[PDB]
Symmetry: D2
Subunit: 266 residues, 4 copies
Amino acid sequence: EGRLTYGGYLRLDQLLSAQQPLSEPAHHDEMLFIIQHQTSELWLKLLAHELRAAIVHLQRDEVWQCRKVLARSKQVLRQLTEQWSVLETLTPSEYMGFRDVLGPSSGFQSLQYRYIEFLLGNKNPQMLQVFAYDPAGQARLREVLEAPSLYEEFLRYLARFGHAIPQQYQARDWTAAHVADDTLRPVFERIYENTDRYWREYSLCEDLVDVETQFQLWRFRHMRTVMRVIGFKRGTGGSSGVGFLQQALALTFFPELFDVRTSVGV
Amino acid sequence: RLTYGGYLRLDQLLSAQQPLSEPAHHDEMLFIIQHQTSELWLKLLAHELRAAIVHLQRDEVWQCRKVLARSKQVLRQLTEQWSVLETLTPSEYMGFRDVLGPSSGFQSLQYRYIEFLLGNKNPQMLQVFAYDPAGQARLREVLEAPSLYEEFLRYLARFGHAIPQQYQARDWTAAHVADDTLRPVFERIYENTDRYWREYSLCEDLVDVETQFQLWRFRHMRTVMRVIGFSSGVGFLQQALALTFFPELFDVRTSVGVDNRPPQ
Amino acid sequence: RLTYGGYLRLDQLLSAQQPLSEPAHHDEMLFIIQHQTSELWLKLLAHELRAAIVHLQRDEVWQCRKVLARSKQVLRQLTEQWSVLETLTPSEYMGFRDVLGPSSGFQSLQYRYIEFLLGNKNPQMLQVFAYDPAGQARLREVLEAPSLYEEFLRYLARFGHAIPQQYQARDWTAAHVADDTLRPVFERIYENTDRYWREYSLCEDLVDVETQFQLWRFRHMRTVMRVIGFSSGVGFLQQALALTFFPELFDVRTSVGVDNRPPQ
Amino acid sequence: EGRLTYGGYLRLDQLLSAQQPLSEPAHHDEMLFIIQHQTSELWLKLLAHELRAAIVHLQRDEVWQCRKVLARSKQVLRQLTEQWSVLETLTPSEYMGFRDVLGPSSGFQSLQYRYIEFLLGNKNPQMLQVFAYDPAGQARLREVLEAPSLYEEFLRYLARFGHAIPQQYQARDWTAAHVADDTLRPVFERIYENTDRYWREYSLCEDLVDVETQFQLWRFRHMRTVMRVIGFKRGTGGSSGVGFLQQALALTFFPELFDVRTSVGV
Ligand code: HEM
Ligand code: HEM
Ligand code: HEM
Ligand code: HEM
Ligand SMILES: N[C@@H](Cc1c[nH]c2ccccc12)C(=O)O
Ligand SMILES: N[C@@H](Cc1c[nH]c2ccccc12)C(=O)O
Ligand SMILES: N[C@@H](Cc1c[nH]c2ccccc12)C(=O)O
Ligand SMILES: N[C@@H](Cc1c[nH]c2ccccc12)C(=O)O
Ligand SMILES: N[C@@H](Cc1c[nH]c2ccccc12)C(=O)O
Ligand SMILES: N[C@@H](Cc1c[nH]c2ccccc12)C(=O)O
Ligand SMILES: N[C@@H](Cc1c[nH]c2ccccc12)C(=O)O
Ligand SMILES: N[C@@H](Cc1c[nH]c2ccccc12)C(=O)O
Ligand SMILES: [Mn+2]
Ligand SMILES: [Mn+2]
Ligand SMILES: [Mn+2]
Ligand SMILES: [Mn+2]
C-alpha cells in the first residue's frame, strides 16, 4: 500500500512479518518472547531519537525544550520498565520449552541499547567488538562514543554560564567513561542551596536524577525477571546471568548528582 | 536466527520507521512508534486470546485463566503507553499532520481481530480490507467462529448451566445480543462461588478484560481529544465507550443477592 | 513526635478502621481502606493545588509547574488504586453492603475542595455540609476565590495577553463559563512556543491535570459499574465525564495552525 | 457523625486530624512526607489483613480462595510500590528544610511493616526490642513470630497432599527464620516438570514468586528514593542508610522457588 494508507504509512507488511519463532513445533510462548523484545527495541529507538534532541537543545542552551524532550524520554523509559510485567507471566517451565532454539545470542548484541548506554555516559570502546559483524551500526556507535555524553553536555552548559566547571570538560577523550569528579561537588551544592536563583540548573539536575533512577528501575526489573525465568543459570551470552545483571545495578551515570546529597544543607 | 538481531529480525523491524515530513519533523517518529508498538502488542494479544478460546474448547480452566492473565497485562501496556503520546502537543502535531493520510487505526486489521474475537462482530468491516483479500479472509474466519464469550457460554452449557439451546448453533457472524435469559445463570454462579469457583473466576476474568479494554478506549479518546480536539472523529470514539462485549456479566450486578452461605 | 508512630500519629490513624458488619466480613476492610487512602491523597492534593495557586499569584512559573508535577503524581495514585477495589466482586460486596449507609464520596468535603479549586464551583453543594458549619465555611472560602484556572488567566492578563477585563473582578462563586474570546489568546500561545514557552508549558500542565482527573472519574465509574452495576447512580458518574475544567484549552485544538517558525 | 454517614463511617474526623507537621514555620513539603507514610501504613494494614486470610485458606486447602486473596495482596503491594513516584518529587533541598524536626525515628519502628516481614517468613525475634515501648503491639508481633509463615504453610499444604516434605515442617521453632532447604529442590522440580498435573501447586508457586518480586521492587524503589533524597548520609535510625537498604534487597523469602529455576528442565 501507498504511504498514505494506515498500513502503508506504518509499513505493517514489513513490521508484522518480522515475528518468526524458531521452535519446532511452534511453542506458544515464543511469540511473547519475540514481541517483548521488539516492542522494547522500538521504544529504545524512540528513546535514542529523543535523547539526541535533548543533547542538541543543551548545546544550544535551550532549557525548556531540553526538559520537554527529557519528559518524553522519562515516559518512554517508564513504558520499557512497566512492560516487564508481561514477561513475568512467562514461567521457567514454559521458557525451557524453547530456550534451546535461541543461539549464543543475548541482549549484549542490542545495538540500540548500547547506543543509549553510550549517550548517557557509560562509554565502553571494548563494546565495539560485539558489533564487528556490522560495521555500519558499529560506525554510528563510534560517533556517540567519541562525542560528549548527555551528562557532559550538561556540564558544558553549566560552564557556559559561569559555573566552576573544570577546563577538561571543554575538550578531552570522550571515548573514556566519565569518572567521579570531586571538584564538581561545590558546583552542585551551590545549585541546590539556592534553587530560586539556579532554578534552571536545579530542574535539569532533577531531570537527570529522574532519568537515571528510571533506568536503574529498568535494570532491576530486568534482573528480577531473569531471576524468576532462568534463576542463577549462566546466560546464553556467556555471563553469570543474574550475577552480571546485579553488578550492572552498581553502575552510575551521574555520580556527582547523587553524591551531592550527602553535603546538601550541611 | 543465531544472533540477537537476526533472531528478532531487527534489520527489518528497525527499518520500518519512515517519516513523511520533509524537512523531517522531530515528533513524527513518536507518532509512528506509538502505532507500531501498539500493533505489535495487538498481534500478541490476538495470539493469546486465540489460545484462551482453545483452552475453553478443551475445558481447560486454569490454562484459560493464565492466558487471560497475560492478555490483561498486554492490554495494560497498550493502555499505559498513551502517556507517551500525551506529550505530543497541538503545536508539534500541526507541524507534520498535513503530510499524513486521512486514515486511523480504524483501518487496523490486528485491532479488528481483537474486536471480533471478543465478540463485537461486524461483517461490514470486511469491506475496508477489500484491498487485502488475504487479511479479509483471515478476519472472516474469526467472524464466522464463536467469540471468546460465546465459547465461555458453550463451556457453561457443557456443565449443567441453563444456557439457551441457541448457543449450540447460530449465525456467529452477527454480534451477540444481550440475552436476559442468561441472568439466572450468572446469578447462580455468583451466589454459590464455593461450588462454581471455576465459572466465577472466569466471569471475573472476562469483566477484567472488558474493563481494561474500556480503559484503553477511554485513554485513546482522551489522547485524541488533547491532540486534535473535538459517525467519526472523537465523537465516534466517545460512542465506542458505550459498546459492551459481555453485557450479561455487568447486568447481573443489579440482581445478585441470594445468600447460600452456611452457618457463620 | 519523636518516634515513627508518634510523629505519624498512627495510634489515631490505625484505629480509624471500624467495620460495621457482624460477623465481620473479610472484604469490608478493603472498602474502608480504599476510601481512607483516597481521602489522604485528596488532602495532599488540595495542599499542593493551593500552593500552585499561590505561585501563579506570585508569577512563579517553574514553582507552579513543580507543584503541578507532584499534583499529577498524586492524581495518578488516586487513579491507579482503583485496581485494588476491582478485586471486590458482587458476591463479596453483597455480604456487607446492607450494613452501610446510603451515602457516597459525593459527601466528601476534601473531594469537593478539589472540584472547587479546579473551577467546578457549585454553591448548592454547600448545603450537604450544613451539618459541619466549619467545613462549610472552609469550603465557601474556596468557592468565593478565583479557581486555579482563573488565576492562570489573571496571570496571563498581567503579561500582555488579551484576557477579557471581566476576569479582573466577578462573582467567582459561579462556575466558569466557556469563553470563546479566549481562543485567540491560546492560539497565539501555541503558535509561538519559542516566545510563550512559560504559558505553553502551563497550558499543557493544566491539560495534564484535567486529563488525569477525567481518568480518575472514568476508573471510578468503571469500578462502580462492575461492583453494583447500572441524577444519581452510575448514570451520574457517566455525566461527570462530560464536565470540563479548562474548556478553552481543549477547544483551541481545533483552530491552531499559524506557522510562525523561522526558515528551516 | 453517626457510623452511617460518609464521614462517620470512615471516621474522617479522626483520620484527617492525624496530619501534624512539626516544622516551624510549617514547611510545605512536610505534608507530603506525612501523607506518603500514612497512605503506606493504611495499605500495609490491608496487606496484613489479606495475607492473614491467605494463610487460613492454605491451612484449609482452599486453593482458589488463597489465590484470590493473594491477587488482591499483589495489587496492594503494587500500590505501595507505585506511590514512590510521588515522593520522588521531594528534592534534597526541600527535605533538608525539615528533616531536623524528625527525631531518631525511622521505618524500623513500623509495626505493620515488621508484621508483613514476619508473615512472609523473615522472622527476627531481635526485632521485638524496638517495640518494647509498646507491649500490646509487641504481643501481636510475637504471635506471627511463633506461627508458621505463609511460605511454611504452603509447604505444609504440599505435605498434606503427599509431596516429599521434610518432617520438620510439621512442627519446629517457627520463631527462627526459614533456612534454604536443598531437600525441597526435587519437590519443586516435580511440580514445574508436570504443570498439567500439579497446576494447583504450580499456580501457588508462581503467586509466591509474584509476591516476593513485587516486595523486592518495593524495597528497590524505597532504596532509590532514599538515595536521591539523603544520598549516602546515615539514617536517623542509626544505620548506614542506603547501604543498609541495599543489603535488604539481598534477603529472600522463598529461596527454594528461585533456586529450582537452575534445575528446571535440566
Ligand atoms: C526470558 C526473558 C529474559 C532472560 C532470561 C534474559 C537474560 C539475560 C542474561 C542472562 C543477560 C546477561 C548476558 C548473558 O550472559 O547472556 C542479559 C543481558 C541483556 N539483556 Fe536480558 N533477558 C530476557 C529478556 C530481555 C528483554 C525483553 C530485553 C529488552 C530488549 C532484554 C535486554 C538485555 C540487554 C540490553 C542486556 C545487556 C545489558 C548490559 O550489557 O548491561 N532482555 N539478559
Ligand atoms: C494523536 C494521534 C491519533 C489521533 C488524532 C487518532 C484519531 C482517531 C480517530 C478520529 C478515530 C475514529 C475513527 C475515524 O474517524 O477514523 C480513531 C480510531 C481508532 N484509532 Fe486512533 N488516533 C491516534 C493514535 C492512535 C494510535 C497510536 C493507535 C494504536 C494503534 C490508534 C488506534 C485506533 C483504533 C484501533 C481505532 C478504531 C476504533 C474503533 O473502531 O472503535 N490511534 N483514531
Ligand atoms: C465499590 C465501591 C463504591 C461504589 C458502589 C460507589 C458509588 C458511587 C455512586 C453511585 C456515586 C454517585 C453519586 C451518588 O449517587 O451518591 C459516587 C460518587 C462519588 N464517589 Fe464513589 N463509590 C465507591 C467507592 C468510592 C471510593 C473508594 C471513593 C474514594 C474516596 C469514592 C469517591 C466518590 C466521589 C468523590 C463522588 C462524587 C463525584 C462527583 O460529585 O462527581 N467512591 N460513588
Ligand atoms: C524522605 C523519604 C525517606 C527516607 C530518606 C527514608 C530513609 C530510610 C533509612 C535511612 C532507613 C534505614 C534505617 C535508618 O538508619 O533510619 C529506612 C528504613 C525503613 N523505611 Fe524508609 N525513608 C523514606 C520514606 C519511607 C516511606 C514513605 C516508607 C513507607 C512507610 C518507609 C519505610 C521504611 C521501612 C519499613 C524501614 C525498615 C526496613 C527494614 O527494616 O528493612 N520509608 N528508611
Ligand atoms: N523531577 C520531577 C519534579 C520536578 C518538576 N519540576 C521541577 C523543577 C525542579 C526540581 C524538580 C522538579 C519532575 O520532573 O516531575
Ligand atoms: N540471554 C538469555 C536469552 C535471551 C534473552 N533475550 C534474547 C533475545 C534474543 C536472543 C536471545 C535472548 C538467556 O540466558 O536465556
Ligand atoms: N487521520 C489523521 C492522521 C492519522 C491519525 N492516525 C493515523 C495513522 C496512520 C496514518 C495517518 C493517521 C488525519 O486527520 O490526517
Ligand atoms: N479478577 C481478579 C481477582 C481474582 C483473582 N482470583 C479470582 C477468582 C475469582 C474471582 C475473582 C478473582 C484477578 O484476576 O486478579
Ligand atoms: N452508597 C452505597 C454504599 C456506599 C458507597 N460508598 C460509601 C462510602 C461510605 C459509606 C457508604 C458507602 C449504598 O448504596 O449503600
Ligand atoms: N506536559 C508534559 C510534557 C511537557 C513537558 N514540558 C513541557 C513544556 C511545554 C509543553 C509540554 C511539556 C509533562 O509535563 O511532562
Ligand atoms: N503469576 C501470574 C501468571 C499466572 C496466572 N495463572 C497462573 C497459573 C500458573 C502459573 C502462572 C500463572 C499471575 O498470577 O497473573
Ligand atoms: N530515617 C529517615 C527519616 C524518616 C523516614 N521516614 C520517616 C517516618 C517517620 C519519622 C522519620 C522518618 C532519614 O534518615 O531521613
Ligand atoms: Mn482435558
Ligand atoms: Mn433470578
Ligand atoms: Mn517574584
Ligand atoms: Mn484566530
